[PDB]
Design a protein around this ligand. Structure first.
Ligand code: ACO
Length: 268
């Protein structure tokens, strides 16, 4: 029998979600189980849990991000630059690999979208416009990014049946950690400025592994190793959301743990 919206709200209340919270969810819909009206039931429950003054922030990215097609080039290759669609924030579908719930979040009425096509975040609430902008190329997940403002607003990370590798907020820890040999990447994104399509090439921290030893694809990255060490040492509210084992993590605490984690293992 499918979970109802009221049942999910009660579970979110037991986990510790309160009205007015700023919550960032990472969801495995298969772990949640069948819902009354599909994935929209969980979206409605999250919005009711945080209340009218609460906020939802999701890393949704973009289904058609030309990341690999422009990686390692000082400019988009000719075939990519001439035909790739421009990133239209209010019309770009989310990246499916990060969870099918994100396409329901980004299409919710009133949801805002950041202008960074590869690191695009979706936000719902009174602080959505403040979270969503600015999000310029070269500041994907570090300072001046929605994650940075999320960390400065007592944000909570809601892992619903998702693995420790999904903690997007830990990309901020990699960005500011004073360690040696941090990996950087160069790619190009097609932006939409005043209806005109503009290619922007930038360099930023490698979000697929900040260090060489964490960047192998077979393959736990620095995010997974930090999150596993954190969850093995920290008391965190845990309980069911639907059929999924869930965690409500203090974002500022796990990021401070991540900075100390990286700086303790690598010289400056
Ligand atoms: C450090 C970083 O930044 S990592 C980047 C950010 N990544 C994240 O946030 C990921 C968080 N989520 C996770 O980690 C999860 O474990 C995942 C997404 C990787 C895998 O979990 P899954 O449950 O297998 O994927 P998902 O959440 O999308 O749900 C899949 C179900 O939704 C279904 N579905 C897909 N689209 C729709 C749709 N429009 N309508 C209804 N159902 C849909 C799929 O068919 C599937 O159902 P099925 O069992 O019948 O095949």
């Amino acid at each position: 029998t499918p979970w109802s919206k009221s049942e999910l709200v009660r579970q979110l209340r037991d986990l510790g979600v309160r009205s007015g919270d700023m919550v960032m969810p990472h969801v495995s819909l298969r772990a949640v189980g069948p819902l009354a009206d599909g994935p929209q039931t969980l979206v409605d429950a999250l919005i009711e849990a945080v209340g009218p003054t609460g906020n939802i922030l999701a890393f949704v990215s973009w289904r058609d991000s030309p990341y690999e097609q422009t990686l390692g080039h000082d400019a988009p290759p000719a075939a990519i630059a001439q035909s790739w669609p421009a990133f239209d924030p209010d019309h770009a579908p989310a990246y499916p690999g990060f969870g099918a719930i994100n396409e329901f979040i980004r299409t919710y009425p009133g949801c805002r979208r950041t202008a960074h096509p590869d690191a695009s975040m979706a936000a719902i609430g009174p602080d959505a416009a403040w979270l969503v902008a600015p999000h310029e190329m070269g500041a994907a997940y570090g300072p001046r990014s929605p994650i940075a403002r999320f960390l400065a607003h007592a944000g909570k990370i809601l892992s619903i049946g998702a693995g420790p590798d999904a903690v997007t907020a830990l990309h901020y820890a990699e960005a500011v950690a004073r360690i040696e040999g941090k990996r950087r990447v160069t790619y190009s994104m097609p932006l939409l400025r005043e209806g005109k399509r503009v290619w922007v090439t930038t360099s930023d921290w490698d979000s697929n592994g900040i260090l060489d030893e964490y960047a192998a694809p077979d393959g736990p990255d620095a995010v997974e190793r930090i999150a596993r060490d954190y969850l093995a040492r920290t008391r965190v509210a845990q309980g069911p959301v639907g059929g999924a084992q869930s965690r409500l993590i203090d974002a500022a605490d796990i990021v401070s743990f991540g900075i100390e984690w990286l700086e303790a293992r690598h010289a400056a």
